[PDB]
PDB file of C-alpha atoms and ligand atoms in Angstrom:
ATOM      1  CA  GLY A   1     -28.325 -56.615 -15.591  1.00  0.00           C
ATOM      2  CA  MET A   2     -32.425 -56.759 -13.097  1.00  0.00           C
ATOM      3  CA  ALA A   3     -36.369 -56.440 -14.916  1.00  0.00           C
ATOM      4  CA  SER A   4     -38.505 -53.519 -13.442  1.00  0.00           C
ATOM      5  CA  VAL A   5     -40.727 -56.097 -12.000  1.00  0.00           C
ATOM      6  CA  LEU A   6     -38.251 -58.980  -9.706  1.00  0.00           C
ATOM      7  CA  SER A   7     -41.915 -60.733  -8.836  1.00  0.00           C
ATOM      8  CA  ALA A   8     -44.423 -60.448  -7.320  1.00  0.00           C
ATOM      9  CA  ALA A   9     -47.159 -61.998  -5.014  1.00  0.00           C
ATOM     10  CA  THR A  10     -51.281 -61.106  -3.989  1.00  0.00           C
ATOM     11  CA  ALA A  11     -53.311 -62.601  -1.198  1.00  0.00           C
ATOM     12  CA  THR A  12     -57.080 -61.593  -0.536  1.00  0.00           C
ATOM     13  CA  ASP A  13     -58.752 -62.656   2.927  1.00  0.00           C
ATOM     14  CA  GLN A  14     -62.291 -62.814   3.433  1.00  0.00           C
ATOM     15  CA  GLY A  15     -61.917 -62.328   7.410  1.00  0.00           C
ATOM     16  CA  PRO A  16     -64.350 -63.656  10.263  1.00  0.00           C
ATOM     17  CA  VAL A  17     -66.718 -60.821   9.940  1.00  0.00           C
ATOM     18  CA  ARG A  18     -67.898 -59.932   6.358  1.00  0.00           C
ATOM     19  CA  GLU A  19     -70.339 -62.820   4.659  1.00  0.00           C
ATOM     20  CA  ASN A  20     -68.352 -62.392   1.855  1.00  0.00           C
ATOM     21  CA  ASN A  21     -65.146 -61.413   0.255  1.00  0.00           C
ATOM     22  CA  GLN A  22     -66.035 -57.854  -1.759  1.00  0.00           C
ATOM     23  CA  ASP A  23     -62.695 -57.710  -2.564  1.00  0.00           C
ATOM     24  CA  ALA A  24     -60.510 -58.842  -6.225  1.00  0.00           C
ATOM     25  CA  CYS A  25     -57.229 -58.157  -7.183  1.00  0.00           C
ATOM     26  CA  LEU A  26     -55.386 -58.268 -10.466  1.00  0.00           C
ATOM     27  CA  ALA A  27     -51.467 -59.466 -11.204  1.00  0.00           C
ATOM     28  CA  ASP A  28     -50.664 -59.507 -14.502  1.00  0.00           C
ATOM     29  CA  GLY A  29     -47.185 -58.773 -16.451  1.00  0.00           C
ATOM     30  CA  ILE A  30     -46.937 -55.088 -15.701  1.00  0.00           C
ATOM     31  CA  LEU A  31     -50.156 -54.267 -14.610  1.00  0.00           C
ATOM     32  CA  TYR A  32     -51.710 -55.027 -10.670  1.00  0.00           C
ATOM     33  CA  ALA A  33     -54.543 -54.167  -9.298  1.00  0.00           C
ATOM     34  CA  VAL A  34     -56.745 -53.880  -5.906  1.00  0.00           C
ATOM     35  CA  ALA A  35     -60.605 -53.697  -6.549  1.00  0.00           C
ATOM     36  CA  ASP A  36     -62.433 -52.985  -3.885  1.00  0.00           C
ATOM     37  CA  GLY A  37     -66.457 -53.860  -3.392  1.00  0.00           C
ATOM     38  CA  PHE A  38     -69.010 -52.384  -1.251  1.00  0.00           C
ATOM     39  CA  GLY A  39     -72.931 -52.960  -2.007  1.00  0.00           C
ATOM     40  CA  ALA A  40     -75.645 -56.016  -2.336  1.00  0.00           C
ATOM     41  CA  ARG A  41     -73.862 -56.562  -5.478  1.00  0.00           C
ATOM     42  CA  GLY A  42     -69.944 -55.319  -4.377  1.00  0.00           C
ATOM     43  CA  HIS A  43     -68.179 -58.457  -4.889  1.00  0.00           C
ATOM     44  CA  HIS A  44     -69.501 -58.708  -8.927  1.00  0.00           C
ATOM     45  CA  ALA A  45     -68.195 -54.958  -9.208  1.00  0.00           C
ATOM     46  CA  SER A  46     -64.948 -55.622  -7.811  1.00  0.00           C
ATOM     47  CA  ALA A  47     -64.488 -58.524 -10.279  1.00  0.00           C
ATOM     48  CA  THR A  48     -66.208 -56.576 -13.048  1.00  0.00           C
ATOM     49  CA  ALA A  49     -64.226 -53.739 -12.883  1.00  0.00           C
ATOM     50  CA  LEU A  50     -60.770 -56.344 -13.156  1.00  0.00           C
ATOM     51  CA  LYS A  51     -61.994 -58.089 -15.570  1.00  0.00           C
ATOM     52  CA  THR A  52     -63.021 -55.407 -17.567  1.00  0.00           C
ATOM     53  CA  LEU A  53     -59.531 -54.271 -17.094  1.00  0.00           C
ATOM     54  CA  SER A  54     -57.692 -56.600 -17.532  1.00  0.00           C
ATOM     55  CA  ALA A  55     -58.993 -56.831 -21.502  1.00  0.00           C
ATOM     56  CA  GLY A  56     -58.759 -53.105 -21.743  1.00  0.00           C
ATOM     57  CA  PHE A  57     -55.249 -52.733 -20.879  1.00  0.00           C
ATOM     58  CA  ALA A  58     -54.343 -55.594 -22.745  1.00  0.00           C
ATOM     59  CA  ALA A  59     -55.724 -54.380 -26.543  1.00  0.00           C
ATOM     60  CA  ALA A  60     -53.865 -50.702 -25.229  1.00  0.00           C
ATOM     61  CA  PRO A  61     -51.063 -51.335 -22.571  1.00  0.00           C
ATOM     62  CA  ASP A  62     -49.668 -47.580 -22.073  1.00  0.00           C
ATOM     63  CA  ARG A  63     -51.187 -44.678 -20.409  1.00  0.00           C
ATOM     64  CA  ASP A  64     -54.543 -44.158 -22.382  1.00  0.00           C
ATOM     65  CA  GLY A  65     -54.823 -47.371 -22.365  1.00  0.00           C
ATOM     66  CA  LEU A  66     -54.779 -47.600 -18.836  1.00  0.00           C
ATOM     67  CA  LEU A  67     -56.878 -44.915 -18.678  1.00  0.00           C
ATOM     68  CA  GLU A  68     -59.153 -45.826 -21.185  1.00  0.00           C
ATOM     69  CA  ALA A  69     -59.303 -49.315 -18.766  1.00  0.00           C
ATOM     70  CA  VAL A  70     -60.550 -47.576 -16.413  1.00  0.00           C
ATOM     71  CA  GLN A  71     -63.011 -45.912 -18.083  1.00  0.00           C
ATOM     72  CA  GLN A  72     -64.287 -48.561 -20.240  1.00  0.00           C
ATOM     73  CA  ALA A  73     -64.388 -50.946 -16.609  1.00  0.00           C
ATOM     74  CA  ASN A  74     -66.328 -47.997 -15.035  1.00  0.00           C
ATOM     75  CA  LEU A  75     -69.665 -48.155 -17.548  1.00  0.00           C
ATOM     76  CA  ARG A  76     -69.338 -51.864 -17.623  1.00  0.00           C
ATOM     77  CA  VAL A  77     -70.143 -52.325 -13.767  1.00  0.00           C
ATOM     78  CA  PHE A  78     -73.367 -49.177 -13.983  1.00  0.00           C
ATOM     79  CA  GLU A  79     -74.555 -50.933 -17.030  1.00  0.00           C
ATOM     80  CA  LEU A  80     -74.628 -54.013 -14.530  1.00  0.00           C
ATOM     81  CA  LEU A  81     -75.543 -53.082 -11.432  1.00  0.00           C
ATOM     82  CA  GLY A  82     -77.004 -49.070 -11.882  1.00  0.00           C
ATOM     83  CA  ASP A  83     -80.650 -50.336 -11.682  1.00  0.00           C
ATOM     84  CA  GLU A  84     -80.284 -51.818  -9.164  1.00  0.00           C
ATOM     85  CA  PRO A  85     -83.081 -50.992  -5.532  1.00  0.00           C
ATOM     86  CA  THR A  86     -79.181 -49.855  -3.323  1.00  0.00           C
ATOM     87  CA  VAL A  87     -75.413 -48.544  -4.742  1.00  0.00           C
ATOM     88  CA  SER A  88     -72.833 -51.601  -5.430  1.00  0.00           C
ATOM     89  CA  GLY A  89     -69.927 -50.040  -7.015  1.00  0.00           C
ATOM     90  CA  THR A  90     -66.491 -50.515  -6.488  1.00  0.00           C
ATOM     91  CA  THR A  91     -62.574 -48.461  -5.138  1.00  0.00           C
ATOM     92  CA  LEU A  92     -59.817 -49.895  -7.872  1.00  0.00           C
ATOM     93  CA  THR A  93     -56.295 -49.013  -7.575  1.00  0.00           C
ATOM     94  CA  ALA A  94     -54.460 -50.285 -10.488  1.00  0.00           C
ATOM     95  CA  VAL A  95     -50.520 -49.600 -10.968  1.00  0.00           C
ATOM     96  CA  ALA A  96     -48.695 -50.528 -14.309  1.00  0.00           C
ATOM     97  CA  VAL A  97     -45.197 -50.786 -13.725  1.00  0.00           C
ATOM     98  CA  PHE A  98     -44.141 -49.256 -18.001  1.00  0.00           C
ATOM     99  CA  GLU A  99     -40.533 -47.978 -19.052  1.00  0.00           C
ATOM    100  CA  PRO A 100     -39.084 -45.267 -19.021  1.00  0.00           C
ATOM    101  CA  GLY A 101     -39.862 -44.886 -22.882  1.00  0.00           C
ATOM    102  CA  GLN A 102     -43.569 -45.296 -21.740  1.00  0.00           C
ATOM    103  CA  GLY A 103     -43.948 -42.937 -19.498  1.00  0.00           C
ATOM    104  CA  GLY A 104     -42.615 -44.538 -16.570  1.00  0.00           C
ATOM    105  CA  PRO A 105     -44.619 -46.012 -13.086  1.00  0.00           C
ATOM    106  CA  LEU A 106     -48.630 -45.531 -13.219  1.00  0.00           C
ATOM    107  CA  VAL A 107     -50.370 -45.799 -11.058  1.00  0.00           C
ATOM    108  CA  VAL A 108     -55.331 -44.504 -11.291  1.00  0.00           C
ATOM    109  CA  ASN A 109     -56.335 -44.666  -8.501  1.00  0.00           C
ATOM    110  CA  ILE A 110     -60.426 -44.123  -7.578  1.00  0.00           C
ATOM    111  CA  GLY A 111     -61.943 -44.701  -4.135  1.00  0.00           C
ATOM    112  CA  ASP A 112     -59.834 -45.560  -0.627  1.00  0.00           C
ATOM    113  CA  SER A 113     -57.444 -48.888  -1.521  1.00  0.00           C
ATOM    114  CA  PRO A 114     -54.547 -47.374  -1.330  1.00  0.00           C
ATOM    115  CA  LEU A 115     -51.091 -47.836  -2.717  1.00  0.00           C
ATOM    116  CA  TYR A 116     -47.443 -47.248  -0.903  1.00  0.00           C
ATOM    117  CA  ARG A 117     -44.171 -47.578  -1.168  1.00  0.00           C
ATOM    118  CA  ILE A 118     -42.126 -49.242   0.299  1.00  0.00           C
ATOM    119  CA  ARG A 119     -38.867 -48.175   1.270  1.00  0.00           C
ATOM    120  CA  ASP A 120     -35.676 -48.249   3.286  1.00  0.00           C
ATOM    121  CA  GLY A 121     -37.775 -49.495   5.685  1.00  0.00           C
ATOM    122  CA  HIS A 122     -39.798 -47.361   5.915  1.00  0.00           C
ATOM    123  CA  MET A 123     -43.923 -47.101   4.053  1.00  0.00           C
ATOM    124  CA  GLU A 124     -45.929 -44.179   3.082  1.00  0.00           C
ATOM    125  CA  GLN A 125     -48.884 -43.957   1.398  1.00  0.00           C
ATOM    126  CA  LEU A 126     -48.874 -42.777  -2.132  1.00  0.00           C
ATOM    127  CA  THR A 127     -52.644 -42.112  -2.345  1.00  0.00           C
ATOM    128  CA  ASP A 128     -55.362 -39.670  -1.344  1.00  0.00           C
ATOM    129  CA  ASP A 129     -58.244 -41.716  -0.501  1.00  0.00           C
ATOM    130  CA  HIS A 130     -61.808 -40.830  -2.014  1.00  0.00           C
ATOM    131  CA  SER A 131     -63.304 -41.265   1.247  1.00  0.00           C
ATOM    132  CA  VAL A 132     -65.082 -38.376   4.382  1.00  0.00           C
ATOM    133  CA  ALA A 133     -62.305 -38.567   5.517  1.00  0.00           C
ATOM    134  CA  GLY A 134     -59.293 -38.900   3.246  1.00  0.00           C
ATOM    135  CA  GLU A 135     -60.854 -36.176   2.219  1.00  0.00           C
ATOM    136  CA  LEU A 136     -59.981 -34.171   5.165  1.00  0.00           C
ATOM    137  CA  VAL A 137     -56.002 -35.674   4.716  1.00  0.00           C
ATOM    138  CA  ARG A 138     -55.707 -34.176   1.159  1.00  0.00           C
ATOM    139  CA  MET A 139     -57.886 -30.385   2.357  1.00  0.00           C
ATOM    140  CA  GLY A 140     -54.291 -31.270   4.978  1.00  0.00           C
ATOM    141  CA  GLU A 141     -56.396 -31.103   8.175  1.00  0.00           C
ATOM    142  CA  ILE A 142     -55.788 -34.409   9.680  1.00  0.00           C
ATOM    143  CA  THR A 143     -53.443 -36.845   8.919  1.00  0.00           C
ATOM    144  CA  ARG A 144     -53.259 -39.948   7.908  1.00  0.00           C
ATOM    145  CA  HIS A 145     -53.071 -41.995  10.918  1.00  0.00           C
ATOM    146  CA  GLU A 146     -56.259 -40.082  12.069  1.00  0.00           C
ATOM    147  CA  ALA A 147     -58.244 -40.555   9.555  1.00  0.00           C
ATOM    148  CA  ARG A 148     -57.879 -44.588   9.931  1.00  0.00           C
ATOM    149  CA  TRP A 149     -60.168 -44.060  12.954  1.00  0.00           C
ATOM    150  CA  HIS A 150     -61.983 -40.868  11.338  1.00  0.00           C
ATOM    151  CA  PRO A 151     -66.117 -41.678  12.173  1.00  0.00           C
ATOM    152  CA  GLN A 152     -66.795 -41.404   8.891  1.00  0.00           C
ATOM    153  CA  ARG A 153     -63.774 -43.653   7.580  1.00  0.00           C
ATOM    154  CA  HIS A 154     -65.827 -45.770   5.833  1.00  0.00           C
ATOM    155  CA  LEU A 155     -68.317 -43.553   3.352  1.00  0.00           C
ATOM    156  CA  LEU A 156     -66.428 -43.376   0.321  1.00  0.00           C
ATOM    157  CA  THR A 157     -66.046 -39.606  -1.973  1.00  0.00           C
ATOM    158  CA  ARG A 158     -65.857 -41.386  -5.359  1.00  0.00           C
ATOM    159  CA  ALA A 159     -65.602 -44.803  -6.785  1.00  0.00           C
ATOM    160  CA  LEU A 160     -66.300 -47.404  -9.870  1.00  0.00           C
ATOM    161  CA  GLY A 161     -69.369 -48.703 -10.687  1.00  0.00           C
ATOM    162  CA  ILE A 162     -72.746 -45.284  -9.129  1.00  0.00           C
ATOM    163  CA  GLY A 163     -72.608 -43.272 -12.393  1.00  0.00           C
ATOM    164  CA  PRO A 164     -71.380 -42.706 -16.162  1.00  0.00           C
ATOM    165  CA  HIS A 165     -68.680 -40.650 -15.638  1.00  0.00           C
ATOM    166  CA  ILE A 166     -65.310 -41.025 -12.961  1.00  0.00           C
ATOM    167  CA  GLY A 167     -62.765 -38.747 -12.551  1.00  0.00           C
ATOM    168  CA  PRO A 168     -59.707 -41.263 -11.123  1.00  0.00           C
ATOM    169  CA  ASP A 169     -56.697 -39.708  -9.730  1.00  0.00           C
ATOM    170  CA  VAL A 170     -53.585 -40.398 -11.932  1.00  0.00           C
ATOM    171  CA  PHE A 171     -49.755 -39.645 -11.485  1.00  0.00           C
ATOM    172  CA  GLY A 172     -46.764 -41.486 -11.915  1.00  0.00           C
ATOM    173  CA  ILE A 173     -44.864 -43.283  -9.475  1.00  0.00           C
ATOM    174  CA  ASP A 174     -41.972 -41.929  -8.132  1.00  0.00           C
ATOM    175  CA  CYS A 175     -39.636 -46.262  -8.256  1.00  0.00           C
ATOM    176  CA  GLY A 176     -36.844 -47.508  -8.301  1.00  0.00           C
ATOM    177  CA  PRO A 177     -35.062 -50.745  -7.611  1.00  0.00           C
ATOM    178  CA  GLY A 178     -34.834 -52.243  -4.481  1.00  0.00           C
ATOM    179  CA  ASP A 179     -37.929 -50.739  -3.994  1.00  0.00           C
ATOM    180  CA  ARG A 180     -40.999 -52.375  -2.813  1.00  0.00           C
ATOM    181  CA  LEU A 181     -44.599 -51.324  -3.914  1.00  0.00           C
ATOM    182  CA  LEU A 182     -48.449 -52.494  -2.462  1.00  0.00           C
ATOM    183  CA  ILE A 183     -51.263 -52.184  -3.261  1.00  0.00           C
ATOM    184  CA  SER A 184     -54.325 -53.079  -0.595  1.00  0.00           C
ATOM    185  CA  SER A 185     -57.915 -51.992   0.578  1.00  0.00           C
ATOM    186  CA  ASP A 186     -58.628 -51.094   3.966  1.00  0.00           C
ATOM    187  CA  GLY A 187     -58.934 -54.331   5.124  1.00  0.00           C
ATOM    188  CA  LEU A 188     -55.227 -53.412   5.569  1.00  0.00           C
ATOM    189  CA  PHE A 189     -55.727 -50.474   8.424  1.00  0.00           C
ATOM    190  CA  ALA A 190     -59.090 -51.290   9.499  1.00  0.00           C
ATOM    191  CA  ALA A 191     -56.945 -52.172  13.312  1.00  0.00           C
ATOM    192  CA  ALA A 192     -53.986 -53.493  13.441  1.00  0.00           C
ATOM    193  CA  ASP A 193     -50.948 -51.966  14.826  1.00  0.00           C
ATOM    194  CA  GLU A 194     -48.805 -50.180  12.169  1.00  0.00           C
ATOM    195  CA  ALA A 195     -45.136 -50.987  13.027  1.00  0.00           C
ATOM    196  CA  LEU A 196     -46.957 -55.225  12.911  1.00  0.00           C
ATOM    197  CA  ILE A 197     -48.046 -54.444   9.184  1.00  0.00           C
ATOM    198  CA  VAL A 198     -44.828 -52.890   8.466  1.00  0.00           C
ATOM    199  CA  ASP A 199     -42.602 -55.858   9.792  1.00  0.00           C
ATOM    200  CA  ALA A 200     -45.569 -57.997   7.426  1.00  0.00           C
ATOM    201  CA  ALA A 201     -44.589 -56.240   4.688  1.00  0.00           C
ATOM    202  CA  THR A 202     -41.062 -55.876   4.750  1.00  0.00           C
ATOM    203  CA  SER A 203     -40.628 -59.077   4.277  1.00  0.00           C
ATOM    204  CA  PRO A 204     -37.666 -60.326   2.418  1.00  0.00           C
ATOM    205  CA  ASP A 205     -40.001 -62.973   0.292  1.00  0.00           C
ATOM    206  CA  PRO A 206     -42.954 -61.029  -1.293  1.00  0.00           C
ATOM    207  CA  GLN A 207     -44.892 -64.732  -1.099  1.00  0.00           C
ATOM    208  CA  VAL A 208     -44.360 -64.022   3.084  1.00  0.00           C
ATOM    209  CA  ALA A 209     -44.519 -60.465   2.559  1.00  0.00           C
ATOM    210  CA  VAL A 210     -48.775 -61.224   1.529  1.00  0.00           C
ATOM    211  CA  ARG A 211     -49.992 -64.622   3.622  1.00  0.00           C
ATOM    212  CA  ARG A 212     -47.802 -62.462   7.155  1.00  0.00           C
ATOM    213  CA  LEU A 213     -50.257 -59.158   5.728  1.00  0.00           C
ATOM    214  CA  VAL A 214     -53.286 -60.921   5.403  1.00  0.00           C
ATOM    215  CA  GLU A 215     -53.038 -62.772   8.593  1.00  0.00           C
ATOM    216  CA  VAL A 216     -52.985 -59.412  11.213  1.00  0.00           C
ATOM    217  CA  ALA A 217     -55.428 -57.913   9.541  1.00  0.00           C
ATOM    218  CA  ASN A 218     -57.042 -61.718  10.442  1.00  0.00           C
ATOM    219  CA  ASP A 219     -54.768 -61.983  14.137  1.00  0.00           C
ATOM    220  CA  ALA A 220     -56.206 -57.672  14.895  1.00  0.00           C
ATOM    221  CA  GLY A 221     -60.150 -58.804  13.864  1.00  0.00           C
ATOM    222  CA  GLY A 222     -60.460 -59.388  10.303  1.00  0.00           C
ATOM    223  CA  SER A 223     -63.107 -56.315  10.773  1.00  0.00           C
ATOM    224  CA  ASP A 224     -63.095 -56.025   7.071  1.00  0.00           C
ATOM    225  CA  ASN A 225     -61.707 -57.904   4.313  1.00  0.00           C
ATOM    226  CA  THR A 226     -58.206 -57.292   3.311  1.00  0.00           C
ATOM    227  CA  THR A 227     -56.028 -58.067  -0.215  1.00  0.00           C
ATOM    228  CA  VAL A 228     -53.093 -56.760  -0.877  1.00  0.00           C
ATOM    229  CA  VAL A 229     -51.078 -56.955  -3.884  1.00  0.00           C
ATOM    230  CA  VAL A 230     -46.832 -56.594  -3.729  1.00  0.00           C
ATOM    231  CA  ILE A 231     -44.492 -55.585  -5.703  1.00  0.00           C
ATOM    232  CA  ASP A 232     -41.272 -56.189  -5.908  1.00  0.00           C
ATOM    233  CA  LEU A 233     -38.795 -53.115  -7.877  1.00  0.00           C
ATOM    234  CA  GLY A 234     -35.402 -53.687  -9.838  1.00  0.00           C
TER     235      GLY A 234
HETATM  236 CL1  LIG B   1     -61.309 -66.247   8.987  1.00  0.00          CL
HETATM  237 MG1  LIG B   2     -67.297 -66.298   7.929  1.00  0.00          MG
HETATM  238 MG1  LIG B   3     -65.839 -54.711   0.420  1.00  0.00          MG
HETATM  239 MG1  LIG B   4     -63.982 -49.310   2.747  1.00  0.00          MG
HETATM  240 MG1  LIG B   5     -61.779 -49.283   6.287  1.00  0.00          MG
HETATM  241 MN1  LIG B   6     -63.069 -52.572   3.002  1.00  0.00          MN
END
């Protein structure tokens, strides 16, 4: 029989516009994550968040430990960056592909770096975006497609590292053998045709998929950093 995780891949692309790649990603064991930093020290925010997340999860690799690790990541980023004259911080979306005995696969997310499930050729977003546009989706006022073009898409309503308390979303992931999970920064959906994103995201080899995903985003203009983590489930 097959393992729960068959394989995983990551890619990140600065793009031709941004002067820094302030995204970060993690793929290690059953833990996968993307962090999209913002502000003058957004690179520091996303890298520190993932370093802290990784260490905390390793110390306690269960649901409560993951949640604790996210809390510790928040506090560490805020302790390091909170006295700056402008605000820097990061999104964080973390997936732990737990076995059923540990409650099954789990997502913890803050900000707007979505988790998607790819199943039978369809790609759908499982997480809510904590942005002005994303809150309008959560309120049932606009569609996710509409949110891509909303003029305040870029303004976050929740972020890691900006204050001492955070309330991430936490939920099980309804997935199973043959599904693919994708974690992405918001750069992926900045501009490109959705069909071509899906074409890339369904590439059978996950290492091809991640390269094609960031190429699609770059070819469309590369206005933002794009980072993707693909996980194939068995
Ligand atoms: Cl480029
Ligand atoms: Mg450049
Ligand atoms: Mg960013
Ligand atoms: Mg953004
Ligand atoms: Mg964006
Ligand atoms: Mn971004």
